[PDB]
Amino acid sequence: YICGDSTECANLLLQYGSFCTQLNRALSGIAAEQDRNTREVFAQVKQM
Amino acid sequence: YICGDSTECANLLLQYGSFCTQLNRALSGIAAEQDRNTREVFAQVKQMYKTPTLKYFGGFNFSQILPDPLKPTKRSFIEDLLFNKVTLAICAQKFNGLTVLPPLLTDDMIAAYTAALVSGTATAGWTFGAGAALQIPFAMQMAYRFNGIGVTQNVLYENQKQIANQFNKAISQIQESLTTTSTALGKLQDVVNQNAQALNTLVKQLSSNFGAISSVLNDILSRLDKVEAEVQIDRLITGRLQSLQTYVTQQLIRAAEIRASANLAATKMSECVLGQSKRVDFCGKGYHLMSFPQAAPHGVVFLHVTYVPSQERNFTT
Amino acid sequence: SRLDKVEAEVQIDRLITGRLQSLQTYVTQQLIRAAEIRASANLAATKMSECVLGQSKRVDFCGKGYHLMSFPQAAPHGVVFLHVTYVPSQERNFTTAPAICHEGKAYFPREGVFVFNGTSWFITQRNFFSPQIITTDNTFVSGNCDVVIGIINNTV
Amino acid sequence: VKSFEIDKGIYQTSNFRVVPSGDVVRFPNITNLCPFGEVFNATKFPSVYAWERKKISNCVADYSVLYNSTFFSTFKCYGVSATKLNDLCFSNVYADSFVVKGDDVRQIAPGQTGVIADYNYKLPDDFMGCVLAWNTRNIDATSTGNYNYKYRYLRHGKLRPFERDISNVPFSPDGKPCTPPALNCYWPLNDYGFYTTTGIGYQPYRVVVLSFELLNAPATVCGPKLSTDLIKNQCVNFNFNGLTGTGVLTPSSKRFQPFQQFGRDVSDFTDSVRDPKTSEILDISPCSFGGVSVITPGTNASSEVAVLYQDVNCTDVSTAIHADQLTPAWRIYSTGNNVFQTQAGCLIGAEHVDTSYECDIPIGAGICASYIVAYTMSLGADSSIAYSNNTIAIPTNFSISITTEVMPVSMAKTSVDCNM
């Protein structure tokens, strides 16, 4: 999203800490929670 | 957090006005909401009782469910299992600017409230709430739960000691399923883990530069002279403020999630505990004959007595 | 008042940036309030469905007694309920007997506990001293009298 | 909070922190004169591909030839500043001495190579000190010619920082060691053309690069400064060899190393230092802090306050009263009491009580206030009970406790003219 190909933009993005890490983590856990929701709403069934 | 301290930097914060005040307003109100969580979740009964320690009722023993007063602490044994099970990854004195402030509700008193509810729920009437208690002997109580599960009382008394074993071994199988065991504890682990993640993230954000020559205060004030100072200092402060503000934002979101679950928490300390929560696949995953509280770090663990009927007849109709 | 083209706008953009993060913060916090407020609002609609359109029999849910009725009234930005609860307040003291062991057989009552073994006179309700003449419908044919705790004879 | 009538409770207010008292300066007893007036006034100043290097070790760096001179062609500090220069004690700053023509000063920076600074003397991109330059056209640049000193201008490419080859390579563009005058076979030697009447961009600039090797030991070279004495268990000021700050000192508990100085315990915050005169001392910089938060009963009853401190042991706090060290410096303010447990700390203005009311204002950890007292807590309506079996109560009276309940079903419907 932020610069796809670069030398410098990757470097200055390293210079701004663990932002990207948190963002990946947060949206990933969002994804994971929706899959959780998909289990939680739907998958109640013992025996199909 | 911003601005550990030197001299300039407090004035440089006050260039942005009341922002420290807003942050502390937010986190204070957050803390107050956690206090509220601990109250409205926990402070649900004025009429606290004595731990009665008869510990055998018909046949039905609450071994280690209750605390046992000849121990040094008045904790129940299962709480202590939970304490030792949950990892935690004079004065607590950092200078990261941060504090895990202690609660209001002290952990013994946490346990005292929970255990008091254990007692007065095991004792002291199905009628529990509006009133105080009406001297009801716990076989009449879960016999009343049979009446609220749709069956008679024959199922109680004619299975009485059987029921005892059917429960009590189960408790011990609880003491199986909790002792050496595994991550069926996961959500409180997630809470403390995300706390550590956000918090250690916030610490590393103090280690994070925001493009400046250094990533730390006063080492900049080893080699600066003039406006360059407040140039990189303002870069620092805006970056640290964005980080800290994203932090405050997410803490607030955590508060929202955590309080929805806390609404549930007081809800199941009400509907599951104090009477029979007649709604279906709510308390455990059976029919909810009973459920009990358990204190826990940063949270609570409920103990759901379901009722799972499993055999087969086949009869014509 | 001292504006040039460029550097003046850079200062202006500093203001725009600060005001914009601040406003966007206000937006975001408003939206947080909106989420909190709407969970509660759904609760309010939920209670006005349960407590107001009827008697929500689930206990300590509307009222902090046992919720006999409820009454809404409006307010600026919010709403205020009046919970017609039910808080019982007095006490008896009697004995219990879970069966009515009359002829050698057991009688578990009406499930809805406490047979009134106040000298084994009658059978009473959950929440008031509410006696019942022991007859064919105060209980049923409940096995035989073996795991009883109480015996109540002279069932005629 | 902007009201005369203010209600009851712990209300937040500002910070509190403790002003330091002492001024601990701990420098070694290193006392010497630098070779500064030796290097910047040498009889020898070489070329750039043959750049001189000097280590400066165990000195007292005055920086006093620096500030009072108008002789300097470029007296410029790049990643550092000229005025905060003797603020730290250094380990082996590095002079790099060379004679350029009159235009390479612009061609010396992190970056700014060109040909000369990339074929004669390569620069770094992280650590900087100061560049100093001057002209010496009155001795070196002789108007008959000063063709004595040279530079190199033919090589296969760029360089890594601080790296030098004396080797006169008779260059050919694919290796091929030639003897000039062969084709694409030259030598890189090139004179300076230094005349007394030479151009301004042709002037012999004797130029020194200063790299600042910033504290890779307990260091050597201080400035003209005054090392002072140690204090323990008291918030003081610092200026160590490459460190500053404000903190509370105590001795260490390390397995400390010989090359070593710092501890950075949780992350990057130094948290233990080795003194430059052989002491091992932890530096717990949190002098004391937290925020004040005023207990007040509501001004329909009182103006009697109590100031709740947070990250406090109530021991340097009575000191901060009676040495006047609290940054909310209060005028009309005594020491009536000091209730201190429940490790949230100092409560100047209430008393230990066992009489436990309903816990009006919850304080810190379990402690609460009334009237003004601050007891711990009533747990609630205690009951002694003995639930025997047959004994059973059933109520025969009641109430209808119509309560409030308050549910905010909207916020203020707001909107923003973001265009205004």
From Swiss-Prot, chain B:
Glycans are attached at N61, N314. The record marks R75, S76 as: Cleavage. Changing A43V: In strain: Isolate GD03. Residues 160-210 are annotated as: Heptad repeat 1. Residues 189-233 form a coiled coil. Changing R75N: Complete loss of trypsin-induced membrane fusion. Residues 76-89 are annotated as: Fusion peptide 1. Changing A32V: In strain: Isolate SZ3. Mediates fusion of the virion and cellular membranes by acting as a class I viral fusion protein. Under the current model, the protein has at least three conformational states: pre-fusion native state, pre-hairpin intermediate state, and post-fusion hairpin state. During viral and target cell membrane fusion, the coiled coil regions (heptad repeats) assume a trimer-of-hairpins structure, positioning the fusion peptide in close proximity to the C-terminal region of the ectodomain. This is Spike protein S2. The chain holds residues 723 to 1059 of 1255 of the full protein.
